[PDB]
Design an enzyme around this catalytic site. Structure first.
Site, PDB file in Angstrom:
ATOM      1  N   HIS A 127     -29.278  17.356  18.056  1.00 27.74           N
ATOM      2  CA  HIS A 127     -27.852  17.332  18.761  1.00 27.74           C
ATOM      3  C   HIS A 127     -26.952  17.814  17.785  1.00 27.74           C
ATOM      4  CE1 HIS A 127     -29.667  14.778  22.038  1.00 27.74           C
ATOM      5  NE2 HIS A 127     -30.101  16.007  22.334  1.00 27.74           N
TER       6      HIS A 127
ATOM      7  N   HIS B  38     -26.903  14.866  14.755  1.00 28.42           N
ATOM      8  CA  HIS B  38     -27.896  13.977  14.758  1.00 28.42           C
ATOM      9  C   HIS B  38     -29.234  14.309  15.367  1.00 28.42           C
ATOM     10  CE1 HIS B  38     -26.108  13.259  18.564  1.00 28.42           C
ATOM     11  NE2 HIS B  38     -27.379  12.632  18.946  1.00 28.42           N
TER      12      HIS B  38
ATOM     13  N   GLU C  37     -35.747  13.898  23.781  1.00 30.06           N
ATOM     14  CA  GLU C  37     -34.633  13.549  25.059  1.00 30.06           C
ATOM     15  C   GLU C  37     -34.879  14.406  26.020  1.00 30.06           C
ATOM     16  OE1 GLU C  37     -30.773  12.140  23.550  1.00 30.06           O
ATOM     17  OE2 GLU C  37     -31.871  10.230  23.684  1.00 30.06           O
TER      18      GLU C  37
ATOM     19  N   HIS D 132     -28.678   3.567  14.976  1.00 29.34           N
ATOM     20  CA  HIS D 132     -29.125   4.285  16.309  1.00 29.34           C
ATOM     21  C   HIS D 132     -30.012   5.591  15.683  1.00 29.34           C
ATOM     22  CE1 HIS D 132     -25.991   1.750  17.946  1.00 29.34           C
ATOM     23  NE2 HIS D 132     -27.123   1.133  18.549  1.00 29.34           N
TER      24      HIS D 132
ATOM     25  N   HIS E  85     -32.849  12.569  17.298  1.00 28.33           N
ATOM     26  CA  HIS E  85     -33.694  11.713  18.120  1.00 28.33           C
ATOM     27  C   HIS E  85     -35.152  12.176  17.758  1.00 28.33           C
ATOM     28  CE1 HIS E  85     -30.142  10.720  20.646  1.00 28.33           C
ATOM     29  NE2 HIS E  85     -30.088  11.860  20.405  1.00 28.33           N
TER      30      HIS E  85
ATOM     31  N   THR F 155     -26.246  10.607  25.678  1.00 28.37           N
ATOM     32  CA  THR F 155     -27.525  10.053  25.917  1.00 28.37           C
ATOM     33  C   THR F 155     -27.631   8.550  25.236  1.00 28.37           C
ATOM     34  OG1 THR F 155     -28.531  10.959  23.887  1.00 28.37           O
ATOM     35  CG2 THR F 155     -28.693  12.509  26.037  1.00 28.37           C
ATOM     36  N   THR F 156     -26.467   8.171  24.570  1.00 26.84           N
ATOM     37  CA  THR F 156     -26.417   6.900  24.275  1.00 26.84           C
ATOM     38  C   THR F 156     -25.070   6.137  24.631  1.00 26.84           C
ATOM     39  OG1 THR F 156     -25.380   7.569  22.478  1.00 26.84           O
ATOM     40  CG2 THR F 156     -27.446   7.033  22.107  1.00 26.84           C
TER      41      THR F 156
HETATM   42  N1  LIG Z   1     -13.049   7.180  21.080  1.00 25.42           N
HETATM   43  C1  LIG Z   1     -14.353   7.288  20.966  1.00 25.42           C
HETATM   44  N2  LIG Z   1     -14.711   7.474  19.636  1.00 25.42           N
HETATM   45  N3  LIG Z   1     -16.291   7.623  19.797  1.00 25.42           N
HETATM   46  C2  LIG Z   1     -16.660   7.106  21.143  1.00 25.42           C
HETATM   47  S1  LIG Z   1     -18.230   7.400  21.549  1.00 25.42           S
HETATM   48  C3  LIG Z   1     -19.003   8.114  20.131  1.00 25.42           C
HETATM   49  C4  LIG Z   1     -20.357   8.444  20.695  1.00 25.42           C
HETATM   50  O1  LIG Z   1     -20.877   7.839  21.424  1.00 25.42           O
HETATM   51  N4  LIG Z   1     -20.960   9.779  20.453  1.00 25.42           N
HETATM   52  C5  LIG Z   1     -22.014  10.669  20.718  1.00 25.42           C
HETATM   53  C6  LIG Z   1     -22.907   9.686  21.658  1.00 25.42           C
HETATM   54  C7  LIG Z   1     -24.221  10.552  22.088  1.00 25.42           C
HETATM   55  C8  LIG Z   1     -24.210  11.882  21.697  1.00 25.42           C
HETATM   56  S2  LIG Z   1     -25.715  12.731  22.214  1.00 25.42           S
HETATM   57  N5  LIG Z   1     -27.019  12.024  21.787  1.00 25.42           N
HETATM   58  O2  LIG Z   1     -25.766  14.013  21.706  1.00 25.42           O
HETATM   59  O3  LIG Z   1     -25.645  12.712  23.633  1.00 25.42           O
HETATM   60  C9  LIG Z   1     -22.991  12.512  21.053  1.00 25.42           C
HETATM   61  C10 LIG Z   1     -22.144  11.825  20.575  1.00 25.42           C
HETATM   62  S3  LIG Z   1     -15.518   7.058  22.061  1.00 25.42           S
HETATM   63 ZN   LIG Z   2     -27.964  12.776  20.697  1.00 26.23          ZN
END
Ligand SMILES: Nc1nnc(SCC(=O)Nc2ccc(S(N)(=O)=O)cc2)s1
Ligand SMILES: [Zn+2]
Ligand SMILES: Nc1nnc(SCC(=O)Nc2ccc(S(N)(=O)=O)cc2)s1
Length: 257
Positions: A116, A91, A103, A61, A93, A195-196
Site C-alpha cells: 500500500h 507498507h 487484503e 502492526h 500486509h 483497512t486498520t
Molecule cells: N491525524 C491522524 N494522523 N494519523 C491518523 S490515522 C493513521 C493511519 O491510520 N494511516 C493509515 C492506515 C491504514 C492505511 S491502509 N492499510 O493503506 O488502508 C493507510 C494509512 S489520523
Molecule cells: Zn495497508
C-alpha cells in the site's frame, strides 16, 4: 488495543471503531467479471522521480517506509483522481504462509502480500486533515506473489533486522519506490476506507491488476518481524491483513478492457 489476534483482531474492531460496519469499508473482493470497464478513466500518473524516503518504522502492526512530504514531490494523479495526491508512506500486509496475506482479493484469490502506497490530497493541506474527507487519500495497492526476487525490494528486506520489534525505527534514505511497481498500470478502483483502525472512510482505492513477484526468501524475512516490543513475549508479525468486507452499494471500475 486492536491488533490481529483471536482476542483483538478484525472481528473485534467494531467495538472501539463502529465505522468497521460502515457503508464503504475496505478491503473488498474484486469480482473481475462484474467490474465494469470505464473508458472515462485516465491512465494513472505515478511521479516518484523526486521521492525522498526518510525512515522505516515498526509500528507494531506493519513496517512503514516514510517519505518527506513537505514539498511537491512523489505524487499520484490522473486515474480516477481529481487533483494531486502526495506520497507519505508505504507498507505491506502479509501472511503466515504464501497462500494468504493480501487484503484485497481477486475472484476470491488471496495473494501472499499486498503493498500500500499511501497518498494524501494536497487540497487539504496535510494528512491529518485529509483523513477527515471522503476524497482525502488515494492508496495504490499492489499484489505480491512468490516467485522471482524483486531486486528493488531487497534494500527494504535487509533493514528489517534493525527494526524487529514494535517502536524501533531506522534511517532509510534514498529508497526509490519505483523499484516496487509492476510493468503495467492497469487498475481497478472503488471508494473505501483505511483497512486498520480508525477505519476512516477517506480512501480512493486504486488496485493494480499486475502483481509483482518477490522471492520466498524476501517474504520469509517479513515474517521474522515482531508485533511485540523488545523484551516482550515474541509474537511473529504475520497475518496482519483485514479480510474482505461487504461491497454494499459500491461499483468497482476497471481501467482496462
Ligand atoms: N491525524 C491522524 N494522523 N494519523 C491518523 S490515522 C493513521 C493511519 O491510520 N494511516 C493509515 C492506515 C491504514 C492505511 S491502509 N492499510 O493503506 O488502508 C493507510 C494509512 S489520523
Ligand atoms: Zn495497508
Ligand atoms: N491496558 C490494556 N490495554 N489492552 C489490554 S488487553 C485487553 C484489551 O484491551 N482488549 C481489547 C481492546 C480493544 C480491542 S478493539 N475493539 O479490537 O480495538 C480489542 C480488545 S490491557
Amino acid at each position: 488495543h486492536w491488533g490481529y489476534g483471536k482476542h483483538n483482531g478484525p472481528e473485534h474492531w467494531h467495538k472501539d471503531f463502529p465505522i468497521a460496519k460502515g457503508e464503504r469499508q475496505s478491503p473488498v473482493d474484486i469480482d473481475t467479471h462484474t467490474a465494469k470497464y470505464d473508458p472515462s478513466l485516465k491512465p494513472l500518473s505515478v511521479s516518484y522521480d523526486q521521492a525522498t524516503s526518510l525512515r522505516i518504522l515498526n509500528n507494531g502492526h506493519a513496517f512503514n517506509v516514510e517519505f518527506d512530504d513537505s514539498q511537491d514531490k512523489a505524487v499520484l494523479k490522473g486515474g480516477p483522481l481529481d487533483g494531486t495526491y502526495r506520497l507519505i508512506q508505504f507498507h505491506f500486509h502479509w501472511g503466515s504462509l504464501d497462500g494468504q496475506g493480501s487484503e484485497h482479493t481477486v475472484d476470491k484469490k488471496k495473494y501472499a502480500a499486498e503493498l500500500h502506497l499511501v497518498h494524501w490530497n494536497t487540497k487539504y493541506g496535510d494528512f491529518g486533515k485529509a483523513v477527515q474527507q471522503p476524497d482525502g487519500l488515494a492508496v495504490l495497492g499492489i499484489f505480491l506473489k512468490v516467485g522471482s526476487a524483486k531486486p528493488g525490494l531487497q534494500k527494504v528486506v535487509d533493514v528489517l533486522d534493525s527494526i524487529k520489534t514494535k517502536g524501533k525505527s531506522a534511517d532509510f534514505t534514498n529508497f526509490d519506490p519505483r523499484g516496487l511497481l509492476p510493468e503495467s498500470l492497469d487498475y481497478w478502483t472503488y471508494p473505501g476506507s483505511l483497512t486498520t483502525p480508525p477505519l476512516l472512510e477517506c480512501v480512493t482505492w486504486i488496485v493494480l491488476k499486475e502483481p509483482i513477484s518477490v522471492s520466498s526468501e524476501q517474504v520469509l524475512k517479513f515474517r521474522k518481524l515482531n508485533f511485540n516490543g523488545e523484551g516482550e513475549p515474541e509474537e511473529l508479525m504475520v497475518d496482519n491483513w483485514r479480510p474482505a468486507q461487504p461491497l454494499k452499494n459500491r461499483q468497482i471500475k476497471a481501467s482496462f478492457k
